[PDB]
Design a protein around this ligand. Structure first.
Ligand SMILES: CC(=O)O[C@H]1C(=O)[C@@]2(C)[C@H]([C@H](OC(=O)c3ccccc3)[C@]3(O)C[C@H](OC(=O)[C@H](O)[C@@H](NC(=O)c4ccccc4)c4ccccc4)C(C)=C1C3(C)C)[C@]1(OC(C)=O)CO[C@@H]1C[C@@H]2O
Ligand SMILES: CC(=O)O[C@H]1C(=O)[C@@]2(C)[C@H]([C@H](OC(=O)c3ccccc3)[C@]3(O)C[C@H](OC(=O)[C@H](O)[C@@H](NC(=O)c4ccccc4)c4ccccc4)C(C)=C1C3(C)C)[C@]1(OC(C)=O)CO[C@@H]1C[C@@H]2O
Ligand SMILES: Nc1nc2c(ncn2[C@@H]2O[C@H](COP(=O)(O)OP(=O)(O)OP(=O)(O)O)[C@@H](O)[C@H]2O)c(=O)[nH]1
Ligand SMILES: Nc1ncnc2c1ncn2[C@@H]1O[C@H](COP(=O)(O)OP(=O)(O)NP(=O)(O)O)[C@@H](O)[C@H]1O
Ligand SMILES: Nc1nc2c(ncn2[C@@H]2O[C@H](COP(=O)(O)OP(=O)(O)O)[C@@H](O)[C@H]2O)c(=O)[nH]1
Ligand SMILES: Nc1nc2c(ncn2[C@@H]2O[C@H](COP(=O)(O)OP(=O)(O)O)[C@@H](O)[C@H]2O)c(=O)[nH]1
Ligand SMILES: [Mg+2]
Ligand SMILES: [Mg+2]
Lengths: 429, 441, 336, 429
């Protein structure tokens, strides 16, 4: 019951998911080969949320791996956990995407999406009662942006009542390593609007800044950035797998995080995050966890929530803690900071409290915020897009692959419209 | 028993047979004095020498061949030479004067004096057969014995036997290179027996094999000993599945069912793809894919021709060695993909795959290399009419002034037979214009 | 006990040049619909649909082997039980009648490998070679008529004029016809190829081999050394009524045979409806074509199969409703 | 009781049957010499279905081997199991067939069929109560097509109430290795119509595609293609030899697979088929076996059943499995896919459940389908035939051997007629 299909697409989405299937596979005691070596009986009662049981008490993840280039598939097989996945879910072409949205959404992605959805329906039709999906991808590439939003817009035509959410990486102007990333991100925010139930927007500039300032890492790699993201992805569906005092599924969050539809772009966040050495100096309590989840420098999206108002937030606590301190600290924040919360919604905060903390610490927490300050993201893209497109720069790599300009200007205008949807619900009483 | 009779007529026909009967002695492990060595207590008919070698008792292998010439000189190189007790003495038939580049001498004057002696010897080989497949007549268009005598013999072999296949391995005149001045008169006159009496006639010419030796093989200055070893690899691959085990074996009658559409459309050109020198046989990718493409190349033809000017009608792929059949279907489907290769519109099942296990034999002193794989491609195409139009034009020049006619009339034929054989070859060339064109209503 | 089939023929090349509209649809296995354009009194044109149901209906893409398999092929396991069996070819002229029966019209020649004559004469011999029926030791012999200007001719012999007499047992016997003894199927194709080369036919540009006579091909099944008749399969190719626009170049010779084709079919049209009602004197002796066809209708061991031929276009919609209405009347017949 | 005579003819039919008598001879523990070395007592209780017992507890197969060329006979004798057959059943001429239908059906096959049927009646008259026959042959050769259909049409004159079925290989336009194979296949589909009770149509393009895509073989040989076919041939007559929970003979299938006569052309199929390595990742259960038997890429006929409707299917399960899961999974398919089944027949599926799985795996299955989509086969032949015959290409090799054109046009028209028999029963309510 309540299964989750995982569709990691591209280079960035596969690197996150390969680190994601190393955290979940530690929470349930899965061996790198696939056997079970846990000690708690709760690690198997809801292991079918992610893992199909196979012959001889081996546990195969319900993950589908997509790329348009065989190289990242060869890395994941040859990594620590290449043994864990099933070899029939490594779907890949040969000709690369080009960091091009059109080449992965129209020419060479539509050729492949028949051979991917036929594998998606092998996972979904074997489940007892499927709950939803999850994409891990990257707004800014060819396969994560283009091929990811072709996969999305072909599942809502077949599974039109399941919770589909994405853990998508959005670009930032401070950290660029792709010239054409505004074209590739605007054309996929337009798809994420009409097709997705929750969208956990993540940046990379926000993830070095957590590693630099909070974690005090000296040389961060991508393995450290994906390690933060994978701690969020496990934290959201915790009450789905472990028993709690309050429970919150994927659908239960989406009911009371999303006031109006089309406003489904969330800011994730994790707590505790300390440096090594400075963990003997922090006492672990509920007022300690709450201060990290609402400080701006512990957001995995490069924004400041002081430039807006939280519509709604959610806080998922994991550990043997009380319920008064959860219900009081989540109260003492939205009265001390009542100018940073929308006042036509009383009690903007949802508390979820599980019973099982992670396997090395007590009392973790996860912050998920629906803030109006996320228009800072969509305007930094829609200023770069409208500065290139007004000169039609780098455009023949898109119009040569089947597209035309009418798809651009529509996608630019739908990005600029939802900026004026968080703007209305920020201000005006 | 899948036996075959080889008939070698004239100087070119004998001298190819020296290159053929060198090769089968090496493929089957027979010493030049007819002996298999003592380290073979195995199945000889399981190696199947018994399509080219009748086993005389007390350990002796004598070939199923007859060498005929009207000249004593060429067969006396076989007596002695090195094969001086390979052949039976009564199957090496010499005349006393050759036909001397004269069809009328080889067919009327001189040829009738030994034609009873040749035919009587073939019956002594036809009676030793159990399961006779057919005849392998080698000659050259453009001799006197290769054209005049062979026309006389194929008439008599059609009356005595008839139902047997009779394959021909002719050497056709080359467009620029010629060695005889009367070379076109002797090729129009052999046209009648080649289309009527033979059942599948092959043609090669010396220019198109000179270029293969120079380009594909880097021989700067070939002799006829280099060339006839290339003719013999075509023959050794064609008749291979009679005498070796393999998946998808092809008899000599499974050609004619799959290669010949209509009873006058039986003139297919052959190729042979890995003609590679031994130094160039390193740096190789001699796979099934590359060796299939090389047969369809217009430069590697054994006839001076260009199959991009006409349409193919059938092909017949015969592979030897380390060949897996799924590699062949992946190589056929690339050939059908290309638009340079035009099939006809009544073919649609393109062509026939034969595969054999026995890899080719490297002749000591040879020019070829030691390959794992080899392909002969027998293929009907409408482009072989262009070789015929280049030779009618040479006949039409000399016969316009009736030049060398007085030699032929004063030897046993009439002037009127030139005007019949010119029309007869012009009717085949009208057939290839009418078989290549697709039909509408 | 008469099976009726219909065959729409396709549209020729010349009828496309004159822009002819096809009105005959065969949507199902055994139906047919005639789309008839009709106008009302106020010049408001409408469209009528005339449904028909037959035993089997043929499309325009069907070949002569498929027409054979459902018409004359079941009637070969009847001739080897002692009965007799016939088949008609009834329709308008130009409606593909001798293309079905005679063979595929290959321009200057007649490809007699098709047709219903050859495909059944082949199938007698395969049936004759079965060990169940080889035990009877029968002899297959073939004869071949021609009915021209109301009189019976012969086509095996060149121009033997023939009489139509009667036995005391009320059996019509053409006498004396030529009855050659057939060895194999290569022999019976020599009769049909020589037969069609001598059949009387006009020469024009529209139908260069139009039928001018009611050809009848018989295959007589005889026991060896008894001179009785154990079975007959009598093919009938008609000539077809022609009275639409046949005014091209008709001299006194052309309409001499012309009004005699139409006279012979009215006698055939009357014997159908006279058999439709009861007890009337069946006018079999009006035309000699109806005297030959007597044993087809009232035969006590007779199983016939009329193949109604239909021209498809708009200008032949009048003859089409004429022709289909008789074949429906032929289907609704119970003799005894 | 219920014996089966096996008449393998030609090159292709002998290569399949030589691999077929190596699978059956493993199911019953027959030594390569012919002795018995089994361990289960069920391997001998119905061993007389295929094997006559000979002197000294040797078990000789009831197989009759036909060829028009001595070469394939020499291969089977010199193979692994040349010791198993009786030397009086190697019937062969000397002059080959020519890949010519006329030469093997009229000239040189009719000369031999007296010396073959006299051997067929030595097997059939010694049986207690014979059930039927089986040909293994090849539409596309001289001996498999021509000589096979002469043997067939001379047994229905003598054994006119026994189940005769064929396991016949049909050509495909993607894989050709014979120029005249449309002439040789159209002239034998015409014989298979009027003379056969079941016909299991197999292609080779459908068998590489199983080896390439499903089995993940790198270099498939004919020994791999015949290995699939031989796993079908054993699977159909399983309940004839081993005890079950539901039983299904050859006649019991033919009753409820064949609605109207002349519609007796079946699509076989086998499950499980995994690659090596990817068998520790698939759990073996009845919903797992059912998904393979109805996926299109596990058909041994090169067709797609989405271009038609299954008239009837059959599923023969082998193993200690339940009966609810068999009766429910065969129900959950023909309601989920109700547009792919003919709706004037309720419950198109027949379930057979044996008790004995193969000797290396538990819970195998066998899919046998009577689909209307098999008109895709008969039209791909009848387009090639009518493109050659309209120019009379390669015709004198047929008319020279006794035939004439009237046999062609009849055989072309009977092929084109049954296309219009699956077409009527596909559509129209
Ligand atoms: C002695 C001690 O208590 O050490 C802690 C520790 O020092 C700190 C600094 C840990 C440490 O984490 C990091 O340094 C880090 C590295 C890359 C990316 C993100 C974090 C720790 O490495 C991480 C490790 O986390 C876990 O064990 C969780 O179960 C965590 N697991 C993983 O991320 C994981 C890592 C490798 C292999 C498999 C899983 C988790 C979190 C959420 C959901 C599932 C699992 C913990 C508590 C510690 C160390 C070991 C030093 C911190 O992180 C986490 C995720 O707990 C960083 O800030 C927190 C606070 C912890 O106190
Ligand atoms: C460790 C293990 O379980 O190995 C399996 C195996 O890995 C797989 C992949 C087997 C394997 O089969 C093949 O790879 C194969 C090769 C050529 C042609 C067809 C298949 C296996 O070879 C085949 C073998 O099959 C049998 O033992 C059956 O009894 C089978 N026997 C034969 O075909 C046979 C082979 C050689 C000699 C004699 C008989 C059979 C099936 C139906 C009816 C009668 C017999 C099995 C289960 C396996 C291996 C050994 C790897 C699979 O095939 C079969 C027929 O079971 C291929 O997909 C299935 C799934 C199996 O799990
Ligand atoms: N490939 C090849 N061609 C040869 C060879 N010998 C002669 N020819 C060709 O044969 C043609 C002439 O035929 P010959 O063989 O010389 O004469 P013939 O057939 O013996 O008849 P005669 O003229 O009476 O000797 C020449 O134009 C050569 O091209 C040879 O050894 N190899
Ligand atoms: N089913 C058919 N398909 C194609 N052509 C056809 C078909 N039926 C008839 N034709 C052609 O129609 C033309 C005339 O056919 P024909 O059989 O003479 O009609 P008809 O009624 O017999 N004329 P007549 O001979 O006076 O009775 C010929 O060119 C035939 O080939
Ligand atoms: N957080 C994170 N970001 C990554 C990783 N790999 C690539 N990226 C970012 O993803 C962006 C481009 O997406 P990419 O991975 O190239 O997707 P693709 O080309 O479509 O497969 C780049 O700006 C990278 O900074 C990773 O492992 N972790
Ligand atoms: N599946 C399979 N097909 C084969 C085998 N051998 C030949 N064929 C196919 O059979 C077709 C021709 O049939 P063939 O074996 O030549 O029959 P024959 O000549 O009448 O004996 C060819 O297209 C081959 O692809 C085999 O072992 N297995
Ligand atoms: Mg000489
Ligand atoms: Mg007519």
């Amino acid at each position: 019951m309540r299964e989750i299909v995982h569709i990691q697409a591209g280079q960035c989405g596969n690197q996150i998911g390969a680190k994601f299937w190393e955290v979940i596979s530690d929470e349930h005691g899965i061996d790198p080969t696939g056997s079970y070596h846990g000690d708690s009986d709760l690690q198997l009662e809801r292991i079918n949320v992610y893992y199909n049981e196979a012959t001889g008490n081996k546990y195969v993840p319900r993950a589908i791996l997509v790329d348009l280039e065989p190289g990242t598939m060869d890395s994941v097989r040859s990594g620590p956990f290449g043994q864990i996945f099933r070899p029939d879910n490594f779907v890949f072409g040969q000709s690369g995407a080009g960091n091009n949205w059109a080449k992965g959404h129209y020419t060479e992605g539509a050729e492949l999406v028949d051979s991917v959805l036929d594998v998606v329906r092998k996972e979904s039709e074997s489940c007892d009662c499927l709950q939803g999906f999850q994409l891990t991808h990257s707004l800014g590439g060819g396969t994560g942006s283009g091929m990811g939003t072709l996969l999305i817009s072909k599942i809502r035509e077949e599974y039109p009542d399941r919770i589909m959410n994405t853990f998508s990486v959005m670009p930032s102007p401070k950290v660029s390593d792709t010239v054409v990333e505004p074209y590739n991100a605007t054309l996929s925010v337009h798809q994420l609007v009409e097709n997705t139930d929750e969208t956990y927007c993540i940046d990379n500039e926000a993830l070095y800044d957590i590693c630099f300032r909070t974690l005090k890492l000296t040389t961060p790699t991508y393995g450290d950035l994906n390690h933060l993201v994978s701690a969020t992805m496990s934290g959201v569906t915790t009450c789905l797998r472990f028993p709690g005092q309050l429970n919150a599924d994927l659908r239960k969050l989406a009911v009371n995080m999303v006031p109006f539809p089309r406003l489904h772009f969330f800011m994730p966040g994790f707590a505790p995050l300390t440096s090594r050495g400075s963990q003997q100096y922090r006492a672990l309590t509920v007022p300690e966890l709450t201060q990290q989840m609402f400080d701006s420098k512990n957001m995995m999206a490069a924004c400041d929530p002081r430039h807006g108002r939280y519509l709604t937030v959610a806080a998922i606590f994991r550990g043997r803690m009380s319920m008064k301190e959860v219900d009081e600290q989540m109260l003492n924040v939205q009265n001390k900071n009542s100018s940073y919360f929308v006042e036509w919604i009383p009690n903007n905060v949802k508390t979820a409290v599980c019973d099982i903390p992670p396997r090395g610490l007590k009392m973790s927490a996860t912050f998920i915020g629906n803030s109006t300050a996320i228009q800072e993201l969509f305007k930094r893209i829609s200023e770069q897009f409208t500065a290139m497109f007004r000169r039609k720069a780098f455009l023949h790599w898109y119009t040569g692959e089947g597209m035309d300009e009418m798809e651009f200007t529509e996608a630019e205008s739908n990005m600029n419209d939802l900026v004026s949807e968080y703007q209305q619900y920020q201000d005006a009483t | 028993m899948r036996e075959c009779i080889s008939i070698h007529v004239g100087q070119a026909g004998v001298q190819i047979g020296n290159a053929c009967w060198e090769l089968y002695c090496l493929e089957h492990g027979i010493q030049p004095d007819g002996q298999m060595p003592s380290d073979k207590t195995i199945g000889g008919g399981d190696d199947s020498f018994n399509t080219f070698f009748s086993e005389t008792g007390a350990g002796k292998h004598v070939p199923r061949a007859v060498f005929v010439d009207l000249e004593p000189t060429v067969i006396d190189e076989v007596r002695t030479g090195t094969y001086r007790q390979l052949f039976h003495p009564e199957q090496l038939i010499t005349g006393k004067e050759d036909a001397a580049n004269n069809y009328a001498r080889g067919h009327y004057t001189i040829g009738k004096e030994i034609i009873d002696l040749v035919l009587d010897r073939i019956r002594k080989l036809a009676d030793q057969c159990t399961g006779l497949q057919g005849f392998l007549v080698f000659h050259s268009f453009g001799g006197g014995t290769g054209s005049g005598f062979t026309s006389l013999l194929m008439e008599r072999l059609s009356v005595d036997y008839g139902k047997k296949s009779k394959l021909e391995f002719s050497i056709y005149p080359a467009p620029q290179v010629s060695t005889a001045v009367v070379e076109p008169y002797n090729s129009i006159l052999t046209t009648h027996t080649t289309l009527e009496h033979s059942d599948c006639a092959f043609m090669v010419d010396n220019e198109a094999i000179y270029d293969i030796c120079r380009r594909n093989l880097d021989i700067e200055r070939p002799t006829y000993t280099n060339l006839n070893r290339l003719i013999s690899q075509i023959v050794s691959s064609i008749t291979a599945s009679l005498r070796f085990d393999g998946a998808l074996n092809v008899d000599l009658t499974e050609f004619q069912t799959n290669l010949v559409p209509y009873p006058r459309i039986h003139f297919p050109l052959a190729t042979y793809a890995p003609v590679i020198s031994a130094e160039k046989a390193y740096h190789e990718q001699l796979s099934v894919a590359e060796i299939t493409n090389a047969c369809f190349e217009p430069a590697n033809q054994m006839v001076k021709c260009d199959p991009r000017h006409g349409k193919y009608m059938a092909c017949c792929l015969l592979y030897r060695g380390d060949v897996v059949p799924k590699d062949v279907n992946a190589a056929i489907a690339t050939i059908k993909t290309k638009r340079s290769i035009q099939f006809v519109d009544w073919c649609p099942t393109g062509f026939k795959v034969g595969i054999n296990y026995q890899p080719p034999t490297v002749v000591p002193g040879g020019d070829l290399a030691k390959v794992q794989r080899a392909v002969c491609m027998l293929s009907n195409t409408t482009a072989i009419a262009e070789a015929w139009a280049r030779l009618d034009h040479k006949f039409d020049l000399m016969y316009a002034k009736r030049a060398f006619v007085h030699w032929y009339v004063g030897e046993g034929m009439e002037e009127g037979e030139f005007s019949e054989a010119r029309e007869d070859m012009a009717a085949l060339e009208k057939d290839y214009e009418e078989v290549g064109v697709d039909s509408v209503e | 006990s008469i099976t009726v089939c219909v065959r729409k023929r396709p549209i020729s090349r010349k009828e496309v040049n004159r822009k002819e509209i096809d009105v005959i649809s065969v949507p199902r296995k055994d139906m047919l619909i005639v789309h008839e354009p009709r106008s009302k009194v106020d010049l408001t044109k409408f469209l009528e649909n005339h449904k028909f149901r037959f035993d089997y209906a043929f499309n325009d893409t069907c070949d002569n082997a498929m027409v054979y398999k459902y018409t004359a092929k079941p009637l070969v396991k009847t001739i080897f039980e002692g009965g007799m069996a016939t088949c008609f070819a009834y329709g308008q002229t130009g409606s593909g009648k001798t293309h079905t029966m005679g063979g595929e019209f290959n321009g200057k020649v007649q490809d007699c490998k098709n047709g219903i004559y050859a495909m059944a004469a082949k199938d007698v011999f395969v049936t004759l070679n079965m060990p169940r029926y080889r035990a009877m030791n029968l002899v297959v012999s073939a004869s071949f008529f021609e009915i021209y200007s109301g009189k019976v001719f012969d086509l095996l012999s060149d121009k033997q004029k023939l009489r139509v007499l009667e036995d005391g047992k009320q059996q019509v016997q053409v006498v004396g016809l030529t009855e050659k003894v057939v060895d194999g199927v290569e022999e019976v194709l020599k009769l049909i190829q020589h037969g069609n080369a001598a059949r009387t036919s006009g020469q024009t540009s529209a139908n260069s081999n139009s039928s001018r006579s009611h050809a009848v091909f018989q295959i007589v099944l005889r026991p060896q050394g008894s001179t009785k008749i154990h079975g007959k399969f009598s093919f009938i190719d008609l000539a077809g009524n022609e009275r639409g626009v046949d005014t091209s170049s008709a001299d006194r010779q052309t309409r001499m045979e012309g009004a005699e084709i139409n006279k012979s079919l009215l006698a055939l049209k009357e014997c159908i409806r006279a058999l439709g009602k009861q007890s009337a004197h069946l006018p079999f002796r009006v035309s000699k074509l109806t005297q030959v066809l007597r044993d087809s209708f009232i035969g006590e061991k007779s199983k016939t199969c009329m193949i109604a031929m239909i021209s498809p276009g708009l200008s032949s919609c009048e003859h089409t409703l004429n022709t289909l209405r008789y074949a429906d009347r032929v289907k609704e017949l119970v003799v005894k």
